[PDB]
Symmetry: C2
Subunit: 747 residues, 2 copies
């Protein structure tokens, strides 16, 4: 046959046909009926069971090369659509799927060609990828000379290649790195210069190629026993199957209608401790991620991000592939926790990411090295939206106020206690607080949005990898969102530099803004802040038996460590993002993990839960009365107990104080409107709105209508007084010729 | 014959043999006799003259695929040694040759295999390259299924990427094509490294077109004159070059030891050097001492013991870059021939100590703008070679040295076409040259990496950049004073016009003049910065007020500043900056440096001093203070010489010199007190501290000359500045199963 796909179609003729049938019918590949599944139920169930089991075995067997992370493997059909994904974080199902769809639309079939036993590698920025260090290995599967699918394997390399602002600070575009199952030497020598340490990159490549070739054999054996006729139907029915599964889940758990929510997070690049080389990049900006969620009677739904802010000079921007592919690590935690999850769910979801926004920049200068900062801040709002549907329908067990900001990313560089390059960081922000439920408190220090199987790691293992020692590891008091049910609290650890040389560290996380919100009366989780101490003189303080900082920063409004370090240079502020800073032995670094949002009116919380929280270190005593209205009294055993009568009076008094200090929304609005007309707000607020308007006309109209603003009132970004480089002149990807990108999104 | 090289040897077996014969015999490839040259001279001269011409033809023909000068092509033998090189800048003969020898040593023959019609590409930093944007295309030449040589084509791509870099796009001899056809995944992947696609794509089409033309040339020559004759020429030609350099040294120079040194400043402690790493935020000085030894047999040695350590900046150099590009200056004085090839390398001994900025041996080091250190280190060699010319009697060949190729005008953003900016004006191609022992230096005439200096037309530059010329003027008092004055630089005043999202920065020497005067002459003027933001020039122009024009004639008594009362003027000695925002009607002074002078300025003929004042080469005030010449403004407003007054001023300055000078012994004792008290700037002590550790022989001489006790030490960690990288290295030896080539004693 002429084309290499089974049947004689080229890779592009094949996909274009399926995509045309998908558009005309609304069903993947125009499969109005799934004959294999309906006519042969057992064989269909067996095909998933064996293929799913073999894909997981590849992932776990290949994993056994350590000294799990983003490691994952996915089986695709000829058109680049996922059928099955292994255990692990599934944020790369779409990134690798896009890499296949890039080879399809750019005629890789003709050059460099797609042959059996070829090995392709990819991490391209313009195709779509979460992190530059996330390396894809893609292998085509052939049966009797014809192509029937692809295999994808991905890892997060931890030692690849300060204060990046533009993309031009590596890139692999579906490069053919091997043939005949043998890697090319020029690729091996070249890729080992893209890295500071060789061991991690080399083993990771072996792992990916291993798992891929296992899965390749796994398919060749399934097809041999059950026949190609059966497998060929399954490779397209399984996708249309996933779509029907998502539709059935929506109709069963949620409510049709329109849900509107928004999320924010800060980017404080004006601070002197953010040492970026470009002066046009030094300004305070805020991420704006509004979302209009539409759930329809037919079980389809739509996520429209009209009104979002523009991309900025920083590393927190994202890709439309990165945004849509990675949003399912969140969705599979509430709506579709299923091992059948595949691209079928994608074909049952509509995404609108306006071109030019931070989630769909369409500009080649954009950097995305730390996309998580924005992604986790934008996705959390969707928890709240869905929860409104769960709450109204009665499935309160599924309600969740949202995920915490996966923040304070402890990052360090230099030479460790073995006089060797640092490569492995602690990664304690895998265990943040979780949002509160409509039924119970949230889980403290339990999970991250991109991995619900939160693991905090052992202190004794991290101290074998980092030149740091734990002086404390403690639950972060009052970090969880207050509410009838408290959001999960984060936790903190105090690090002391120990046997480090040429050492540097920086902070990474939300500071001025709490990305998550409480739900239906609950409050947002605590926001971030920084603590670090240099020139502590701790060696002499330890030797002399003086007071030394231990534990966690219990009350940063009334700290106890600072006074213990009189000769120290202490940095204690809300600057939760910094650039590389010099550290040396006996200096201190507070690693503070965020908490989750709360649920419900705080003064509906059962008083004993407040007393249990104070005794447990989840809430500072101070706020027991101010926030929850609970009067607690310390007893003989040192434990706090509830004052039943005193609480009732406090709760009744707060209710009157609320009505007194509050104001009718009509009244407050006209006052806020005067400030809007006078353009009275910080530059970060005005820049956010000014940029959001230009990229979102529908958002500007609603804003003007809601505030009853006259057309005479305008908010041009160019008149705020901050740099605006990149707001009117762009570097589109359309400038690149011979490059055909695929659109997974309305814009 | 299994090995692909002619005869059956593999590439490594072949080179390994030739290199062992070179080490053993002191003659390239163990050629004690050149049979072809001696027994068939006409045929020998014919092969060279014809290959040289065919190579030049390929370079000039391919050049017509755009519209540069760094473009160049080189013909190599099977072992990766240069035979011939096209017209153009020859910095990349060694870099590309090193790429070939990398494929030889790392078994490219077995994987990915070296086949006919294959296309390779390379710019690797660890192999050694001048610039990250200088891209190599390497094609193997075959004859009857066997490899007989290589072709290398290079271009300087202007629109690549990568800020205030402090530590380290790498293409490691990648096979980017087969069957003379490029791979699609390579073409797509390359269009993401560049800002605009045009320049990258035409440059590759240019390199390949030239490589294939040279491949056809060899195939044609071999076919007509026979492969037997060519296979002899392909190695005799190298040894031939070695003998040629030996003859030139013995005919032009003098045996002995020459000692010289050069310096340049890295002022990274200034706030306008926005660097992301705080441990790279300090002031440092480059130290480039050179002990030059010419032996009686005609061999010579270049020992850079005592040089400073690599730093957190983009001015470090690879050993291959330092030795491959040094021949751009050697071909301007010692061996200016079109026959130049690697024979000159096998006739020269280089010692670049490991850890120094020229041989860092650390993977973190960056090399983006290594010219700043190279031009400052090479200028000292002119002076050494000149002492041999001057003693032997070839005063015409003397030259005090090359100016720092500084102020590198760099701009970014969007231009008057609302398109990405990629073409910057290249006025630092026309710096002042060093004065000779016979005549003044040439003003605004050349750079060290290109003697064919061209300034460009202002009208052409304004079609490329969003800038307009408000001035273009000879730089007064930039040339080094002396009996014969060093060449003066020039300066242009630029106004930003129709730019958007525009940024600019300065680049060059500031506190230090790298060049020195010779035998009584003085160094050229050092660098400084002038820029003006928020000028309000639009209204000053409209109202008819004074507007800055021309050049910054006297920065000690400027005229522009008073004209700009509302402007933010940056007028300091910070000649290196990171990108800074610029808007229309802002000003940027592009000041090109001059060259060093020769001889005692007091021995300069007075009428030359008067001509210099009249011509804007020397400011009036220095005619008496420096040259001791009294001038009077004549009727026509021109300056003339006062013979009698000049004779007195010269007689008085001679007494002043003896009165204000002191015996060197008396000065040394006082300067020795300061060394013991460690009374000096941190940039000075860090330089010496780093130099001592890398050069024990240099430290030994320092302590000896100053009679310092062993109790006196200068540890770098006690200076008070960051010392990151001094004690902990990421040596390249770590990288697994990567085999490097040492062209240097380290
Ligand atoms: Mn990753
Ligand atoms: Mn170059």
């Amino acid at each position: 046959t002429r084309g290499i796909v089974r049947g004689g179609e080229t890779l592009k003729e094949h996909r274009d046909r399926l995509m045309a049938a998908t558009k005309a019918t609304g069903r993947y590949a125009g499969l109005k009926t799934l004959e294999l599944r309906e006519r042969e139920p057992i064989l269909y169930n067996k095909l998933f069971s064996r293929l799913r089991a073999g894909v997981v075995d590849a992932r776990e067997t290949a994993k056994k090369i350590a000294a799990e992370g983003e490691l994952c493997f996915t089986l695709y059909n000829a058109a680049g659509d996922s059928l099955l994904t292994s255990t692990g974080i599934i944020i790369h199902v779409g990134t690798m799927g896009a890499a296949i769809k890039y080879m399809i639309e750019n005629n890789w079939e003709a050059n460099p060609g797609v042959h059996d036993k070829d090995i392709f590698c990819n991490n391209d920025s313009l195709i779509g990828n979460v992190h530059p260090c996330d390396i894809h290995t893609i292998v085509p599967i052939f049966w009797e000379g014809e192509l029937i699918g692809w295999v994808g394997g991905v890892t997060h390399v931890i030692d690849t290649g300060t204060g990046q602002v533009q993309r031009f600070g590596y890139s692999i575009t579906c490069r053919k790195v091997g043939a005949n199952d043998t890697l090319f030497r020029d690729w091996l020598h070249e890729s080992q210069r893209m890295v500071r340490t060789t061991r991690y990159w080399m083993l990771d490549e072996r792992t990916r190629i291993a798992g891929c070739h296992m899965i390749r054999k796994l398919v060749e054996e399934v097809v041999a026993e059950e026949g190609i006729e059966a497998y060929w139907k399954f490779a397209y029915e399984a996708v249309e199957h996933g779509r029907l599964g998502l539709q059935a889940r929506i109709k069963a758990m949620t409510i049709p209608g329109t849900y509107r929510q928004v999320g924010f997070v800060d980017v404080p690049y004006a601070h002197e401790d953010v040492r970026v080389p470009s002066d046009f990049a030094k300004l305070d900006t805020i991420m704006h991620a509004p979302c209009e969620m539409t759930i329809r009677r037919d079980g389809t739904w739509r996520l429209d991000f009209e009104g979002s802010s523009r991309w900025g000079w920083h590393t927190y921007n994202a890709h439309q592939v990165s945004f849509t592919s990675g949003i399912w690590v969140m969705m599979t935690q509430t709506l579709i926790p299923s091992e059948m999850i595949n691209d079928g769910a994608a074909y049952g979801t509509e995404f609108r990411l306006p071109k030019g926004t931070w989630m769909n920049p369409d500009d080649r200068r954009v950097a995305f090295s730390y996309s998580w900062h924005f992604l986790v801040s934008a996705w959390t709002a969707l928890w709240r939206g869905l929860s409104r549907s769960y709450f109204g329908r009665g499935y309160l067990e599924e309600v969740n106020a949202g995920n915490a900001n996966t923040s304070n990313w402890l990052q360090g560089g230099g030479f460790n206690q073995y006089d060797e390059i640092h490569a492995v960081n602690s990664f304690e922000c895998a265990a943040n607080g979780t949002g509160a439920t409509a039924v119970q408190d949230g889980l403290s220090h339990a999970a991250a949005i991109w991995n619900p199987e939160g693991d905090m790691g052992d202190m004794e293992i991290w101290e074998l990898a980092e030149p740091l020692v734990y002086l404390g590891r403690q639950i972060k008091a009052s970090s969880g969102g207050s509410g009838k049910y408290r959001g999960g609290c984060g936790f903190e650890s105090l690090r002391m530099v120990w046997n480090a040389k040429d050492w540097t560290m920086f902070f990474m996380g939300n500071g001025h803004i709490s990305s998550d919100w409480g739900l239906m009366g609950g409050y947002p989780a605590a926001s971030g802040y920084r603590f670090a101490a240099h020139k502590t003189n701790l060696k002499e303080l330890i030797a002399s038996g003086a007071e030394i900082p231990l534990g966690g920063d219990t009350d940063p409004e009334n700290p106890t460590w600072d006074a213990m370090l009189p000769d120290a240079q202490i940095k204690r502020d809300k600057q939760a993002i910094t650039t590389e800073e010099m550290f040396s032995d006996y200096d201190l670094y507070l690693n503070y993990m965020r908490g989750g949002p709360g649920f419900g009116d705080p003064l509906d919380r059962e008083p004993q839960a407040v007393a249990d929280d104070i005794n447990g270190g989840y809430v500072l005593e101070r706020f027991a009365g101010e926030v929850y209205g609970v009067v607690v009294r310390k007893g003989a055993d040192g434990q706090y107990g509830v004052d039943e009568a005193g609480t009732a009076a406090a709760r009744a008094q707060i209710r009157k104080d609320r009505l007194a200090k509050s104001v009718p929304v009509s009244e407050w609005m006209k006052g806020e409107r005067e400030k809007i007309l006078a353009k009275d707000a910080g530059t970060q607020v005005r820049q956010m709105f000014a940029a959001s308007f230009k990229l979102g006309p529908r958002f500007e109209k609603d804003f003007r209508t809601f505030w009853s603003l006259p057309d005479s009132w305008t908010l041009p970004e160019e008149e705020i007084g901050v740099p605006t480089y990149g707001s009117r002149y762009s570097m589109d990807i359309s400038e690149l010729p011979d490059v055909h990108t695929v659109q997974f999104v309305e814009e």
